[PDB]
Amino acid sequence: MIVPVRCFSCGKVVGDKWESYLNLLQEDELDEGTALSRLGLKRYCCRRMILTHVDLIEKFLRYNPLEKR
């Protein structure tokens, strides 16, 4: 639903690189491989965590809140 905080295999913190990953892809016109290496994810266990992630939270946010303050 949202980017996992840590890598499952080794526990490296990858939850703080989602926005950076998206910025590299969009603004810098970098391919997925270069963006991951730029972010410092060398082990393919970390690469798949960010490469294969699906951001479903954005889809949920389209719905109006059930309770509004």
């Binding site: 996992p4 905080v5 840590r6 890598c7 499952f8 295999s9 526990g11």
Partner: protein, 49 residues
């Protein structure tokens, strides 16, 4: 892992690997048995229920 079994990583499980939700819904109605007997939603007391 013999005979179609497997070994999973506990650390990966702790971090949230293959961890899912589960929702169960319960339905109930205030049936009205004709014209006299009827039901209501209430917190019953041991002295009256």
């Amino acid at each position: 892992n013999q005979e179609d079994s497997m070994i999973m990583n506990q650390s990966s499980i702790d971090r949230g690997l293959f961890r899912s939700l589960f929702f169960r819904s319960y339905m109930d109605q205030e049936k009205k048995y004709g014209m006299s007997i009827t039901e209501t939603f209430e917190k019953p007391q041991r002295t009256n229920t």
